[PDB]
Design a binder for this molecule. Sequence first.
Ligand SMILES: [Mg+2]
Ligand SMILES: [Mg+2]
Ligand SMILES: [Mg+2]
Ligand SMILES: [Mg+2]
Ligand SMILES: [Mg+2]
Ligand SMILES: [Mg+2]
Ligand SMILES: [Mg+2]
Ligand SMILES: [Mg+2]
Ligand SMILES: [Mg+2]
Ligand SMILES: [Mg+2]
Ligand SMILES: [Mg+2]
Lengths: 135, 29, 91, 97, 77, 252, 112
Amino acid sequence: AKFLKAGKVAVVVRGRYAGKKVVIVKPHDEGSKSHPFGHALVAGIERYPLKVTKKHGAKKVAKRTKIKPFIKVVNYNHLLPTRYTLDVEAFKSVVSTETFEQPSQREEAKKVVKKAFEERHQAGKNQWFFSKLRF
Amino acid sequence: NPLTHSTPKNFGIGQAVQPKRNLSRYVKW
Amino acid sequence: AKRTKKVGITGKYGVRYGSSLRRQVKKLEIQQHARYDCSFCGKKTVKRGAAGIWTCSCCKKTVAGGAYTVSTAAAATVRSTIRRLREMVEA
Amino acid sequence: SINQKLALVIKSGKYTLGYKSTVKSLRQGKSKLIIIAANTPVLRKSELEYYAMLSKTKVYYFQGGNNELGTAVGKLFRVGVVSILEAGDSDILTTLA
Amino acid sequence: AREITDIKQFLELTRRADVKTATVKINKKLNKAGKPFRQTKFKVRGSSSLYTLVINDAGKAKKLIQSLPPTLKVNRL
Amino acid sequence: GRVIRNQRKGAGSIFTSHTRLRQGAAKLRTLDYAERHGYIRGIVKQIVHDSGRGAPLAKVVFRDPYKYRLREEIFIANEGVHTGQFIYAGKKASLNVGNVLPLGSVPEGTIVSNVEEKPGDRGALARASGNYVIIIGHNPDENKTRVRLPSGAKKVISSDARGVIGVIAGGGRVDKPLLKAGRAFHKYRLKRNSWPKTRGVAMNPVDHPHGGGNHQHIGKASTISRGAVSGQKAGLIAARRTGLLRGSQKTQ
Amino acid sequence: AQRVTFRRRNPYNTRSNKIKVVKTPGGILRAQHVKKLATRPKCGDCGSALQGISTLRPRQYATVSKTHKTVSRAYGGSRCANCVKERIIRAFLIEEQKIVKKVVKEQTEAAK
RNA sequence: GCUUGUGACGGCCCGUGAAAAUCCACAGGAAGGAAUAGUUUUCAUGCCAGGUCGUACUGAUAACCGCAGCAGGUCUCCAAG
RNA sequence: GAUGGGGAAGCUCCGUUUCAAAGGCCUGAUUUUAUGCAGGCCACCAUCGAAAGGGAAUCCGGUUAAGAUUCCGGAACCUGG
Ligand SMILES: [Mg+2]
Ligand SMILES: [Mg+2]
Ligand SMILES: [Mg+2]
Ligand SMILES: [Mg+2]
Ligand SMILES: [Mg+2]
Ligand SMILES: [Mg+2]
Ligand SMILES: [Mg+2]
Ligand SMILES: [Mg+2]
Ligand SMILES: [Mg+2]
Ligand SMILES: [Mg+2]
Ligand SMILES: [Mg+2]
């Protein structure tokens, strides 16, 4: 079966966010005018939240758990497709082709994506997603 | 229970840095 | 045209040193200066780099080898002996 | 024997030679069977195994390196990974490959 | 050492505390082929460096000399 | 008389080893809890030339068991090893070319090099280019192992002595004739001042036992007592036989 | 041909006492002392001169800003782009095979 | 073209052709962290200070060694038709 | 080439990391006020040895009976505050 889908996790392999975890939100497979190649929109996380422990409480637990996210357009060549899965109903209509090519329009998405990922980390869902791949 | 995990370390030759044991029998007085 | 009937590479020494010591040096200078085939990348790019050291131009893997050649009859027959002794234990 | 099987594929059926194009054909999902030579590096051998198990493709191991997988498919060059898109005259799906 | 191209920037460095001295050089150059033209150069002395300007237009050379500070020591040539 | 040349070398003014460019002493790892119980893994970072030495050296890196850091060793490179390979050291290691194993754990007919005389000494026997010992039968009682050393001598050593597997790199180095003096000159330049060499029969009597004479001749027998003294020993020392050898060669 | 001297007491031609001839506004030739060339910094994995980093003599790197000494990536002015790429795969595939190990290896001891 | 510097290459070895001070970067996330303001002096500008000893001339058929203003001896850079 | 040690009737010889209890540093916590504890590492352990090896940073134009990359005029750059 064809694995590059809307609900699938991946690992970025090149460029600033290299060695970080993402989700392929919209696969533009067969070329384009701008970006003339097999490309894909992504929506992962830049800063991972730290190892909270049983000594910490109330205030420091909140500071240790803050997820600065990001969004990108990425070539299929610069991704590792993985067998893990993550849902994309929380930010399907927000991130789009029309969202990019506008400086002010990128923040509104990021603030909505940050809301999705911080809701997911609090109460353990997708642990592999919110843990740093170590190299 | 809520956020923190249980991921053990393996102190058994060539893996994990050995812990701070009591080394009183081997001290060069 | 072919330049020398017999001497070849040992012509540099001219008339000196005796014929058999030049003939012995031709033999071993044909071996060390030559290019050899790589184990990992599969190309005739392995070249000597001091006695015992053999590297690949591309792929960059170095290997420890003979003085004037990559493999030799001492290490060739030892390769089968270490292979055969382990087959008692493993197989 | 694998030598009789790959001989009939080159003239009639389709194929692709090399890593960049196997993974391009394996990401799309056109590959029926990928072949992997011996001397190919392990990190790449393990990634081709991982991309093949996601796409669901068989992984035969050619006995010998890239220099004799080229003569096996008939080309005059070293080739380190062969993906077979359309199996033509031969039958590499059901057989030992 | 340092040069400035913009004329709006140069007027700010004339009132930057340490800048006391300044100077206005007149030159005599030529361009294109035939007849020559009259060039001017305005230089100010900071503590670390000398900032300077190159104005080829003779029309705007008169406007810049008129708009300097009063306490600045301006030395011709 | 004077003081002979060979008496002069013991004071070591100009007869010391020239050792600027050397890489380092070529020992094994220090024997610890990790090597005499399980095993421990290291990577060969690069193999490299060493001055005044026929064989190449391997800079081999391990990780320290008792504190967070790395440890760099210098092994003598065996004929087979390549950079990036994993060297597996200790007791429970497989029978592979480059791994270091205790002489008890290998079977018979096994070919090891850079082997300890007594356990924990870190290198001793078979360290030149193209050398090795053969393990030739074991002894379960008193844990002793019987071996064959490069000279043909048959020793019995401890079974807990360690020994890296395979022959040493740089084999067949003495086949190619040097041809000229310039090549001998450069060889010794990076070892010690022992070249070139003048014959004793060409000196005056103050300088040697073989001096003087109206022809060049030794004059008395060249074979000399085990228990002569400093100044008398020059020639063949404790020679049980002499002359060009006939019959079968080598040790039985 | 107007000949020229050294400008410092060291009169021998070493690596640190090099000379360049230079024409001046007085209209004479004159010697100028040249400094030693900087090498490129190397990657600590392959050994390639690594791109987007300045080439200066080592104490110069104290004066310069942070942009001139790095790139924006994991292992900035330390490993090259190809080296980081590879150890991200290798870190992932071994740790993917580590989960595939413990799924199969636990079932091995369980069903025996 | 001459002198010199530099760049990518190629030959040669049983010769594979110093070290240390010093300066940087990365991995790591300790600690400190924000909205009526902190963090930045690795961005720009601005203020202050930088001791001690040597520094003249010869460098050779007259300033050095050779009993001397001795046909000897004494390391090195620049180089016109 | 000192030290700790060990030789030597002694002038002294050996040895330089050695069978030795071998020495320094960062924040705070403070508001008797100067550092009382919080705890972390480091075992690196004398020192001498290059006016051609390594090494932070300067140029032009003027000037004297005899000085200058050192003075004067202009324009710079480092290092520590
Ligand atoms: Mg002789
Ligand atoms: Mg002799
Ligand atoms: Mg004589
Ligand atoms: Mg006698
Ligand atoms: Mg005598
Ligand atoms: Mg005679
Ligand atoms: Mg110097
Ligand atoms: Mg002078
Ligand atoms: Mg003079
Ligand atoms: Mg000193
Ligand atoms: Mg003067």
